[PDB]
Ligand binder design. Structure first.
Ligand SMILES: *[C@@H]1O[C@H](CO)[C@@H](O[C@@H]2O[C@H](CO)[C@@H](O[C@@H]3O[C@H](CO[C@H]4O[C@H](CO)[C@@H](O)[C@H](O[C@H]5O[C@H](CO)[C@@H](O)[C@H](O)[C@@H]5O)[C@@H]4O)[C@@H](O)[C@H](O[C@H]4O[C@H](CO)[C@@H](O)[C@H](O)[C@@H]4O[C@H]4O[C@H](CO)[C@@H](O)[C@H](O)[C@@H]4O[C@H]4O[C@H](CO)[C@@H](O)[C@H](O)[C@@H]4O)[C@@H]3O)[C@H](O)[C@H]2NC(C)=O)[C@H](O)[C@H]1NC(C)=O
Ligand SMILES: *[C@@H]1O[C@H](CO)[C@@H](O[C@@H]2O[C@H](CO)[C@@H](O[C@@H]3O[C@H](CO[C@H]4O[C@H](CO)[C@@H](O)[C@H](O)[C@@H]4O)[C@@H](O)[C@H](O[C@H]4O[C@H](CO)[C@@H](O)[C@H](O)[C@@H]4O[C@H]4O[C@H](CO)[C@@H](O)[C@H](O)[C@@H]4O)[C@@H]3O)[C@H](O)[C@H]2NC(C)=O)[C@H](O)[C@H]1NC(C)=O
Ligand SMILES: *[C@@H]1O[C@H](CO)[C@@H](O[C@@H]2O[C@H](CO)[C@@H](O[C@@H]3O[C@H](CO[C@H]4O[C@H](CO)[C@@H](O)[C@H](O)[C@@H]4O)[C@@H](O)[C@H](O[C@H]4O[C@H](CO)[C@@H](O)[C@H](O)[C@@H]4O)[C@@H]3O)[C@H](O)[C@H]2NC(C)=O)[C@H](O)[C@H]1NC(C)=O
Ligand SMILES: *[C@@H]1O[C@H](CO)[C@@H](O[C@@H]2O[C@H](CO)[C@@H](O[C@@H]3O[C@H](CO)[C@@H](O)[C@H](O[C@H]4O[C@H](CO)[C@@H](O)[C@H](O)[C@@H]4O)[C@@H]3O)[C@H](O)[C@H]2NC(C)=O)[C@H](O)[C@H]1NC(C)=O
Ligand SMILES: *[C@@H]1O[C@H](CO)[C@@H](O[C@@H]2O[C@H](CO)[C@@H](O[C@@H]3O[C@H](CO[C@H]4O[C@H](CO)[C@@H](O)[C@H](O)[C@@H]4O)[C@@H](O)[C@H](O)[C@@H]3O)[C@H](O)[C@H]2NC(C)=O)[C@H](O)[C@H]1NC(C)=O
Ligand SMILES: *[C@@H]1O[C@H](CO)[C@@H](O[C@@H]2O[C@H](CO)[C@@H](O[C@@H]3O[C@H](CO)[C@@H](O)[C@H](O)[C@@H]3O)[C@H](O)[C@H]2NC(C)=O)[C@H](O)[C@H]1NC(C)=O
Ligand SMILES: *[C@@H]1O[C@H](CO)[C@@H](O[C@@H]2O[C@H](CO)[C@@H](O[C@@H]3O[C@H](CO)[C@@H](O)[C@H](O)[C@@H]3O)[C@H](O)[C@H]2NC(C)=O)[C@H](O)[C@H]1NC(C)=O
Ligand SMILES: *[C@@H]1O[C@H](CO)[C@@H](O[C@@H]2O[C@H](CO)[C@@H](O)[C@H](O)[C@H]2NC(C)=O)[C@H](O)[C@H]1NC(C)=O
Ligand SMILES: *[C@@H]1O[C@H](CO)[C@@H](O[C@@H]2O[C@H](CO)[C@@H](O)[C@H](O)[C@H]2NC(C)=O)[C@H](O)[C@H]1NC(C)=O
Ligand SMILES: *[C@@H]1O[C@H](CO)[C@@H](O[C@@H]2O[C@H](CO)[C@@H](O)[C@H](O)[C@H]2NC(C)=O)[C@H](O)[C@H]1NC(C)=O
Ligand SMILES: *[C@@H]1O[C@H](CO)[C@@H](O[C@@H]2O[C@H](CO)[C@@H](O)[C@H](O)[C@H]2NC(C)=O)[C@H](O)[C@H]1NC(C)=O
Ligand SMILES: *[C@@H]1O[C@H](CO)[C@@H](O[C@@H]2O[C@H](CO)[C@@H](O)[C@H](O)[C@H]2NC(C)=O)[C@H](O)[C@H]1NC(C)=O
Ligand SMILES: *[C@@H]1O[C@H](CO)[C@@H](O)[C@H](O)[C@H]1NC(C)=O
Ligand SMILES: *[C@@H]1O[C@H](CO)[C@@H](O)[C@H](O)[C@H]1NC(C)=O
Ligand SMILES: *[C@@H]1O[C@H](CO)[C@@H](O)[C@H](O)[C@H]1NC(C)=O
Ligand SMILES: *[C@@H]1O[C@H](CO)[C@@H](O)[C@H](O)[C@H]1NC(C)=O
Ligand SMILES: *[C@@H]1O[C@H](CO)[C@@H](O)[C@H](O)[C@H]1NC(C)=O
Ligand SMILES: *[C@@H]1O[C@H](CO)[C@@H](O)[C@H](O)[C@H]1NC(C)=O
Lengths: 196, 748, 342, 51
């Protein structure tokens, strides 16, 4: 579905966003250069925008002044461009830091940071290249169907001694009289032991 | 082809020539599926069966827009048009996706020229701009005579004789004759438009100086027609034509608008044979005073011949003007013709152009006689009778490629952005209502006191010749060589006393002030300009800038006559006044309730002034932090006035290359849009309903749907349970799981 | 977030002057780009914020104050209804935050009648301040959903639990509790109630005062910056460049086109440069905010929905839960932590 | 430092003292508590040197 979605399920939402973002990055790089280049036509307060045309008409005593105006303007354009470039690098550095964290935590290790790599139970992620970046495919589990479970807070032997499960992630419940223990996350039941 | 008059572009109860991408033969066959070379197609269906058509390339191109059409029939035809890129019928990038409902039996179709795609929907035409549409030269057809479908594959350059009567098309006859018509002949459309797709074979853009070679721009050009007269039959016996196409012979082709034009345009015929190109003859103009004669010769000795070359030469031709006043045979060289002559244009204003280039300027022309001696009719292709319009033009090698008139709101957006077709989304708009405004004047208290000056010139000609120079010009300031303002107010005129002759042969001379060496225009010294001191002189004064006085004989020769000298110093003792105000003790003016130009306590601008009353303790001027008036208090009293800019900006929503709706500040109907809603901080104007599926464009908490109506946005629905606690309870614990893959992109 | 700004290519250069409409043709490729940048940015930001502000009707309903009981929540909870066709209103704290620190109604800017207010005065120069994205109803829906999650414990149906239990679970997370009787809860509910009252009072006018002051200073700062940027852009219109005037009309009233067009071209160049500068400033601000949104989302997930163990993150202490409310252009988080006493 | 309204004097501030001079320098009738730059240029006639 993802490959088809990219070629042309709620995956389509997520894929669309990735495509929009990738396209955006590309467009910006082009746009910046086009602006820089276009500014060469912006004749400043001078006879022409062609230095040669100025020197074909005026002797140096005046031509140098006309040209100095063009020079000033063009240097200013370059200064502006440089500032823009530096700002973009700063943004990307931020993104690289994040990308490295995801590589470490969501690819190499496997985190427990709910809400981070994938809206669900993260099992693994695949990474591929993309224009100027990385594409992550986060494989998660989503519950489909769950059981109704008759949970108990604990066992109180002889009316005196409560005993409770040591681990808070477990549920003690009555399977129609048979007491069993399950994870609160996944229905993988087993019998209890005293060591629980 | 059983076309409507609307499709043909013809007038009722008449007979015209229609040129272009027309239907002819009909493929009444049951071969199911076939491919043709094509520039378009027409088809007629009535039967209850699907049909389809496509215009495409000879190979698959991932980035070409392809044109796909489907028709399904019930009570009416359900007609779908899609112009999109396709995945080798899966579209993924679309210019248009539309559904029309059409009359059964109608001939519907598509024609392409360059990047222009025209959709013919029987009663109407809709135009799209589609990148590289000219590549779509293969036509695929899915259609059988068995199910009533017939179609005509459109090729090119068809000329048809059309007869109409009582709303019907009577005749539709393809010419075997009409050679070359498709390059020069067309029918005038409703409102005087030249048909889309026409090739402007010999139509130049007019200029007064430089020429365009390649690019896109808005021009002011004589491209709206009131008439158009094919192969007009002009002969030496024809006589004079008076600009308005109301002559007995002027059987215009297409629609006619019985008014008065700005220019006449002569589209000239010629061949490769120079001896069929050079004609004996003259062009004569009837001016308000004298006849003026234009003619040319091969050598410079104009007295030896009288010709007009049409088409290409092989030698230079010299062109002269003659005009005679009581045997005063004034004669002058004007210029050299271009290597090839293709078009002559004459304005009522007196301006005369060849191939777009201005050669001379007569004071005024009442009528023209294009007096070519001949043997035939074949000297002209057509005479056009036209007025100036604001048009967006695609120019290439100086020629017109694409002509867009901007009359409608959408066409105006194309003009405003200089772009042949837009990108669906939102655009700003402010279609400034350019016009003449009344002027208001508000100033601090002062007694009114005014003096008149005229700078006058009286002239004599014919001292030894004309054209060479004036014989003598007498220049004066109220009769003096020096006049000064010693008054609070003043105003100045310029007068050229041609009338001194009693018999204005001097109407052939134009004498006027040139732009000076001064930081002001002479003619604008009557606006509310302010000085400490001025003084004017007709003689040289040290330190004084000036305005040269120049003379010409019909803008051929130019010479300096003299100059007006002026001195000044800045300050606010003397103010220029637009006219000789009288009676009034203290001068001011205030106009309320529609646009004005104003000068108010030295703030200058335009807008609408309205009265109000607020407790504005303090001074008399209220401005924005941008220095613009918000209002003012009228000094002598407590009345206050509010100043607003009448040309307000708005936001326009565009979809499928059309205006969908607009967001405005003003409680009014707008760009054809009628349905007005009030929303917490704006008005929305549409033509849509209140039942419209989905947004196609969005912002904030609302979207604009396909028909322009507004749809509220709602946040994505999502939910889950909390975390179960250590409590005796009925819990819900996931058993069955599935998996999904989520996609994230990061730039590195 | 921050407010989108769109500025007209022409109106901000020559405010309705038909002469410039011609002169500006030569800058189409440089002037249009201003609008392209601003419109795109608005689009991107709108989409991003919209992707956060999701809604759950069950939790919203369960956000009722009666789910919280002894701990109160009344100054945090959205007004359930304002007897109107609207899902929710601002909480008491939100009304306080917004009112203390303080979209344009453009319908008024055509009536004349009054000396114009600042907004219209900017509107008149082609500077439009657009409607927001994170509107009050969306923020309340989002917020209420987050709050109901505090009591919608993991039961069948959509049954809720007492907030007392919810908190007990969040305590066991930190250290399994060995006491049947919750001696701690009455102490903590009372302490909590005082803390909340102190915060609301601190905002209206405990070391909470330090923390509240910082939040206020920061909120005010954001507001001031948006205003300042627009004022600068607008003020620059007065900066007559090397020309006779700063009024194009005044130039055309004095000089014929042969000179006037040159004087005006100087003004045009200057004004286009001002717009280019403005756009750059805007884009930089968006970048900053994007950084902040990433963080905010992490805190929503880890410190509201789950409960982390990231000491030093959400709250300088033992994190039990957090409450989120809206604030001017942002979110306010109230992190409830435990502090040892003895 | 003068506050002018309808050409008339509304508020007249003489700037002789250091604080009044700051008000003059910033053209503002009262300041905001905090830090300000200052350089009260000692305008006068100087001797001229030539090297
Ligand atoms: C330098 O010179 C300045 C230039 O002149 C000076 O500023 C001016 O200061 C005077 C003070 O003397 C301003 O006073 C105005 O008075 C209105 C008049 O009513 C009062 O005076 C009458 C005469 O004195 C009395 O008859 C009347 O009292 C009676 O009625 C009362 C009401 O019924 C009752 O309680 C009394 O008993 C009695 O019976 C009364 O005392 C007054 O309406 C005016 O309006 C302001 O306040 C309203 C309330 O806050 C707002 O609603 C209005 O909306 C005004 O505020 C605006 O102006 C402030 C000043 O400019 C801004 O802070 C506000 O932001 C707001 O500005 C907006 O609107 C402007 C448009 O209206 C717009 O231009 C702005 O951009 C912005 O949009 C006010 O008190 C006088 O108007 C000031 N004048 C000007 C032109 O600014 C400044 O003081 C001097 N500098 C120094 C150092 O002193
Ligand atoms: C080279 O440079 C010359 C430089 O001058 C330029 O020629 C000038 O062209 C304009 C256009 O060609 C001519 O000026 C006037 O144009 C209007 C155009 O119509 C528009 O405007 C009216 C008014 O806004 C609208 O209603 C209409 O829809 C259009 O949108 C003409 O209508 C004017 O004609 C007047 O004179 C005729 C003859 O005198 C009358 O029959 C007509 O009624 C007009 O009367 C009006 O104007 C008078 C002006 O003195 C006034 O007194 C009357 O009350 C009344 O209002 C008109 O011609 C301008 O005249 C041209 N120049 C010259 C020398 O005449 C060339 O175009 C340029 N060439 C190129 C290729 O660039
Ligand atoms: C991670 O992100 C995903 C997106 O990638 C979120 O998962 C979705 O969660 C919602 C709730 O959070 C799911 O809930 C289901 O919604 C369906 C939608 O109904 C609407 O649309 C249909 C179709 O447009 C309309 O006819 C209907 O009126 C609605 O307007 C319901 O149709 C589902 O209920 C049905 O199935 C259940 C289960 O078999 C039955 O009990 C019900 O009777 C009924 O038949 C249901 O509510 C939605 O499926 C989930 N998305 C996906 C991809 O699965 C995840 O929650 C999110 N976060 C996390 C951590 O998982
Ligand atoms: C522009 O001017 C050209 C003239 O330079 C003109 O083209 C000519 O049109 C006529 C009219 O359209 C042609 O038709 C001729 O008609 C006479 C009629 O009796 C015939 O005798 C001619 O026969 C000669 O040409 C045949 C074709 O080449 C030969 O087979 C035969 O022997 C003869 O020599 C002929 O049919 C004439 O051909 C053309 N002229 C040229 C140069 O082709 C053109 O129509 C103009 N058009 C307009 C609207 O002004
Ligand atoms: C524009 O004004 C000009 C200003 O004068 C005109 O110039 C004049 O043109 C006429 C013809 O163009 C000249 O004609 C002269 O005729 C005499 C007489 O001899 C001729 O006639 C006898 C009888 O027909 C014949 O036998 C002879 O061969 C001649 O053909 C000649 O002797 C002169 O040489 C000359 O050709 C005028 O002199 C002449 N003006 C000038 C300055 O030479 C011009 O015609 C006007 N243009 C147009 C198109 O009307
Ligand atoms: C500016 O020049 C004009 C011409 O040189 C001189 O003023 C002209 O004075 C007449 C008489 O006062 C004005 O009225 C005319 O009266 C006749 C006879 O009744 C009538 O046919 C004309 O229609 C007209 O009314 C004429 O308007 C006025 N001309 C102008 C242009 O205002 C005027 O004296 C000059 N300035 C100076 C300082 O002399
Ligand atoms: C925008 O323009 C429309 C222009 O029609 C304004 O709406 C109109 O408002 C009047 C005044 O409220 C309506 O009421 C009419 O009053 C007269 C006088 O009382 C009475 O004779 C008529 O029977 C009627 O009540 C008029 O219905 C209404 N127009 C429409 C189409 O309903 C509108 O308010 C303007 N809107 C804004 C926000 O300014
Ligand atoms: C310029 O002024 C002179 C001076 O006013 C005009 O020539 C005079 O004409 C009258 C009438 O023919 C004679 O009586 C005078 O003797 C002439 N004066 C001189 C000095 O010769 C001349 O005609 C005016 N010229 C123009 C172009 O108006
Ligand atoms: C052309 O002739 C008219 C006569 O045909 C000339 O104008 C007249 O000239 C005489 C004396 O030369 C004056 O008495 C008349 O009163 C004049 N007419 C008028 C209306 O005043 C005219 O000047 C000749 N024009 C030329 C050669 O340019
Ligand atoms: C979310 O679920 C609700 C619950 O069924 C939707 O149902 C109604 O949708 C209409 C039109 O979409 C709204 O006017 C009603 O207010 C909604 N009903 C209720 C009970 O609120 C709603 O469509 C769903 N989707 C979204 C995005 O909100
Ligand atoms: C531990 O004891 C408290 C007392 O037995 C139980 O909590 C009671 O739950 C009922 C539920 O309807 C409420 O009415 C009572 O007010 C709660 N009472 C008190 C005193 O808190 C609690 O359920 C026990 N069980 C667990 C798991 O804690
Ligand atoms: C908590 O729930 C009550 C539940 O009854 C809400 O108050 C009710 O609001 C409806 C609103 O349409 C009124 O008809 C009922 O009469 C109100 N209840 C009572 C007891 O008067 C209350 O607003 C909810 N509170 C919160 C914070 O959401
Ligand atoms: C055809 O167009 C005319 C406008 O030219 C319009 O009045 C008419 O109703 C249209 N008719 C149909 C059937 O669409
Ligand atoms: C279109 O041209 C081909 C030649 O290009 C011709 O065979 C065909 O029949 C023409 N189309 C029609 C409708 O006749
Ligand atoms: C068109 O028809 C009219 C009527 O048949 C005839 O006068 C005219 O010459 C025809 N034109 C052509 C090109 O056949
Ligand atoms: C100056 O003009 C007045 C204009 O009425 C005239 O009388 C006077 O004689 C002229 N001056 C001279 C020196 O001729
Ligand atoms: C508009 O202006 C014309 C003069 O330009 C005047 O006749 C008319 O009354 C005006 N007022 C309005 C509101 O239409
Ligand atoms: C005065 O102000 C009122 C203020 O409520 C307004 O209705 C009225 O039109 C005003 N204008 C004038 C000129 O009276």
């Amino acid at each position: 579905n993802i490959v088809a979605s990219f070629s042309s399920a709620e995956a389509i939402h997520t894929v669309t966003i990735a495509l929009n973002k990738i396209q955006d990055v590309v467009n910006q790089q082009g746009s910046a250069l086009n602006h820089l280049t276009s500014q060469l036509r912006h004749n400043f307060q001078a006879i022409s925008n062609s230095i040669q045309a100025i020197y074909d008409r005026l002797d140096s005593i005046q031509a140098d002044q006309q040209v100095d105006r063009l020079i000033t303007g063009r240097l200013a354009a370059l200064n502006a461009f440089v500032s823009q470039v530096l700002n973009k690098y700063t943004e990307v550095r931020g993104s690289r830091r994040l990308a490295q964290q995801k590589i470490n935590e969501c690819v190499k290790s496997q985190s427990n940071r709910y809400g981070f790599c994938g809206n669900g139970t993260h099992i693994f992620s695949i990474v591929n290249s993309a224009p100027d970046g990385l594409l992550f495919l986060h494989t998660v589990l989503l519950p489909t169907d769950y059981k109704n479970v008759k949970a108990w807070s604990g066992i109180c032997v002889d009316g005196i001694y409560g005993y409770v499960l040591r681990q808070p992630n477990l549920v003690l419940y009555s399977d129609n009289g048979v007491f069993r223990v399950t994870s609160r996350v996944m229905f993988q039941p087993r019998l209890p032991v005293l060591s629980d | 082809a059983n076309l409507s008059m609307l499709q043909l572009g013809v007038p009722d109860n008449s007979s015209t020539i229609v040129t272009g991408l027309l239907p002819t033969h009909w493929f009444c066959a049951n071969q199911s599926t076939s491919v043709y070379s094509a520039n378009g197609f027409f088809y007629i269906d009535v039967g209850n069966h699907r049909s389809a058509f496509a215009l495409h390339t000879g190979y698959y191109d991932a980035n070409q827009y392809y044109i796909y059409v489907t028709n399904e029939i019930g009570l009416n035809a359900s007609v779908t048009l899609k112009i999109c890129k396709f995945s080798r019928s899966s579209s993924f990038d679309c210019i248009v996706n539309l559904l029309f409902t059409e009359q059964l039996g109608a001939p519907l179709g598509i024609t392409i020229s360059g990047e222009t795609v025209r959709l013919h929907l029987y009663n109407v035409t809709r135009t799209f701009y589609v990148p590289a549409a000219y590549k779509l030269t293969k036509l695929s057809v899915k259609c059988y005579f068995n199910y009533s479908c017939v179609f005509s594959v459109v090729n090119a350059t068809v000329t048809v004789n059309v007869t109409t009567h009582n709303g019907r098309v009577v005749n539709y006859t393809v010419c075997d004759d009409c050679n070359g018509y498709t390059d020069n002949i067309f029918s005038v459309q409703q409102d005087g438009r030249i048909p889309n797709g026409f090739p402007f074979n010999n139509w130049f853009l007019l200029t007064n100086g430089s020429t365009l070679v390649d690019g896109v721009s808005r021009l002011y050009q004589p491209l709206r027609l009131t008439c158009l007269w094919p192969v007009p039959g002009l002969k030496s016996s024809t006589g004079f034509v008076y600009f308005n196409a109301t002559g007995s012979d002027v059987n215009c082709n297409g629609y006619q608008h019985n008014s008065v034009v700005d220019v006449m345009r002569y589209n000239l015929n010629f061949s490769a044979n120079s001896l069929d190109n050079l004609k004996s003859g003259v062009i004569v103009f009837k001016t308000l005073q004298y006849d003026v004669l234009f003619y040319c010769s091969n050598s410079s000795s104009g007295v030896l011949d009288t010709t007009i070359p049409f088409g290409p030469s092989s030698q230079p031709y010299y062109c002269f003007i003659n005009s005679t006043i009581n045997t005063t045979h004034v004669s002058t060289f004007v210029g050299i013709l271009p290597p090839t002559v293709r078009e002559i244009v004459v304005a009522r204003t007196g301006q005369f152009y060849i191939n777009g280039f201005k050669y001379f300027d007569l004071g005024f022309i009442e009528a023209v006689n294009f007096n070519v001696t001949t043997a035939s009719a074949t000297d002209f292709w057509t005479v056009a009778f036209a007025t100036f319009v604001d048009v967006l033009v695609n120019v290439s090698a100086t020629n017109i490629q694409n002509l867009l008139y901007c009359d409608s709101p959408f066409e105006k957006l194309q003009c405003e952005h200089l772009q042949f077709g837009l990108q669906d989304g939102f655009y700003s708009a402010n279609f400034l209502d350019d016009n003449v405004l009344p002027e208001t004047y508000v100033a601090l208290p002062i007694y009114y006191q005014h003096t008149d000056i005229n700078f006058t010139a009286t002239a004599s000609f014919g001292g030894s010749c004309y054209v060479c120079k004036p014989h003598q010009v007498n220049i004066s300031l109220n009769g003096n060589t020096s006049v000064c303002v010693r008054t609070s107010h003043f105003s100045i005129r310029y007068i050229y006393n041609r009338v001194k002759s009693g018999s204005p042969g001097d109407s052939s001379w134009h004498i006027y002030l040139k732009s000076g060496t001064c930081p002001f225009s002479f003619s604008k010294l009557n606006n509310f300009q302010k000085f400490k001191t001025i003084c004017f002189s007709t003689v040289e004064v040290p330190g004084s800038c000036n305005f040269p006085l120049e003379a010409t004989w019909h803008y051929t020769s130019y010479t300096i006559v003299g100059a007006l000298y002026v001195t000044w110093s800045e300050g606010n003792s003397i103010t220029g006044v637009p006219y000789p105000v009288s009676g009034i003790r203290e001068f001011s003016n205030l106009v309320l309730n529609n646009c004005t130009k104003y000068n108010i306590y030295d703030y200058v601008g335009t807008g609408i002034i309205r009265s109000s009353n607020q407790s504005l303790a303090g001074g008399i001027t209220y401005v924005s932090n941008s220095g613009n008036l918000l209002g003012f208090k009228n000094v002598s009293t407590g009345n206050i006035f509010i100043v607003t800019p009448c040309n307000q900006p708005d936001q326009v929503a565009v979809y499928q290359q059309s205006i969908i709706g607009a967001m405005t500040a003003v409680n009014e109907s707008r760009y054809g849009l009628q349905n007005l809603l009030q929303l917490p901080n704006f008005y929305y104007v549409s033509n849509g309903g209140n039942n419209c599926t989905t947004a196609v464009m969005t912002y904030s908490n609302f979207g604009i749907c396909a028909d322009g109506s507004l749809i509220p946005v709602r946040p994505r629905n999502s939910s889950d349970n909390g975390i179960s606690a250590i409590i005796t309870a009925n819990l819900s614990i996931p058993s069955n799981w599935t998996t999904s893959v989520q996609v994230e992109y990061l730039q590195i | 977030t921050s407010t989108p700004i769109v500025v007209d290519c022409a109106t901000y250069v020559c405010n309705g002057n038909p002469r410039c409409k011609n002169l500006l043709k030569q800058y189409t490729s440089a002037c249009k780009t201003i609008e392209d940048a601003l419109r795109l940015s608005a689009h991107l930001e709108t989409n991003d914020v919209s992707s956060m502000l999701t809604f759950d009707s069950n939790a919203f309903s369960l956000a009722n104050v009666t789910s919280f009981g002894d701990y109160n929540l009344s100054s945090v909870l959205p007004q359930r209804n304002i007897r109107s066709s609207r899902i929710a209103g601002r909480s008491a704290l939100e009304d306080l935050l917004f009112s203390k620190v303080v979209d344009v109604d453009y319908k008024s800017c055509t009536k004349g009648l009054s000396i114009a207010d600042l907004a219209c005065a900017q509107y008149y120069n082609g500077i439009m301040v657009l409607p927001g994205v994170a509107d009050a109803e969306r923020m309340a829906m989002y917020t209420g959903s987050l709050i109901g999650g505090m009591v919608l414990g993991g039961l069948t149906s959509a049954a809720a639990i007492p907030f007392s239990l919810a908190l007990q679970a969040r305590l066991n997370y930190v250290a399994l509790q060995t006491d049947v009787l919750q001696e701690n809860q009455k102490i903590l509910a009372a302490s909590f109630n005082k803390a909340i009252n102190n915060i609301v009072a601190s905002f209206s006018s405990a070391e909470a005062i330090h923390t509240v002051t910082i939040a206020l200073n920061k909120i005010q700062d954001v507001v001031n910056q948006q205003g300042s940027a627009l004022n600068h852009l607008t003020s620059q219109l007065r900066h007559n460049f090397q020309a006779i005037s700063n009024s194009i009309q005044a130039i055309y009233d004095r000089l014929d086109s042969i000179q006037a067009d040159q004087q005006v071209d100087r003004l045009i160049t200057g004004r286009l440069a001002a717009l280019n500068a403005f756009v750059s400033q805007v884009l930089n601000k968006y970048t900053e905010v994007r950084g902040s949104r990433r963080l905010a989302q992490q805190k929503i997930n880890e410190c509201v929905k789950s409960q982390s163990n990231r000491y030093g993150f959400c709250g300088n202490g033992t994190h039990i839960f957090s409450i989120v409310n809206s604030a001017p252009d942002g979110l306010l988080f109230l992190h409830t932590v435990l502090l040892p006493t003895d």
